[PDB]
Amino acid sequence: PNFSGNWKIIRSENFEELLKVLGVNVMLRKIAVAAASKYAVEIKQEGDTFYIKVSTTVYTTEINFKVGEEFEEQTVDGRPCKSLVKWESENKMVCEQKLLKGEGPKTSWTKELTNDGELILTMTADDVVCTQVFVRE
């Protein structure tokens, strides 16, 4: 596997519906969907250590983790969480999240590198699955 790359989004499905489950009100959801049309993910992978930088027009966030080792990040709607990534196969990993404070929907995400060179991200909140597809710049 080599997830390393500068990835640009080409497709985004069910993102609005994901934000709805997470309690985001409709006007902000629409504005968020619009910001997702621009967004980029930069990955540097060495072995099972990942550096991931997610950026939109006005905001950028960095995620650092090692597979199998708990780390802290934030949920999609911004609530801090404890995360743990595991491989599910050669080119797919899955992250389970646990809220640091309080309660809410069960969230998770996955990243997969397809055989045709796409990166597929999924983000889940309860029953709702958002799928986003990226290609290398």
Ligand X SMILES: *C/C=C(C)/C=C/C=C(C)/C=C/C1=C(C)CCCC1(C)C
The residue count for the chain: 137
Q: Are 129 and 122 in contact (CB under 8 A)?
A: yes
State the minimum distance, in angstroms, from the CB of residue 137 to ligand X: 16
Do 5 and 117 meet the contact criterion of CB atoms below 8 Å apart?
A: no
Nearer to ligand X, 18 or 127 (CB): 18
Q: Does 121 bind ligand X (CB under 6 A)?
A: yes
* Touching ligand X, residues 18-77 (CB under 6 A): 32, 35-36, 39, 41, 52, 54, 56, 76
CB of 84 to ligand X, least distance (A): 13
Distance CA 25, CA 11 (A): 23
Shortest reach from residue 10's CB to ligand X, in Å? 13
The HSE-up count of residue 19 (CA atoms within 13 Å, CB side) is 18
* Footprint of ligand X (CB under 6 A): 32, 35-36, 39, 41, 52, 54, 56, 76, 109, 111, 121
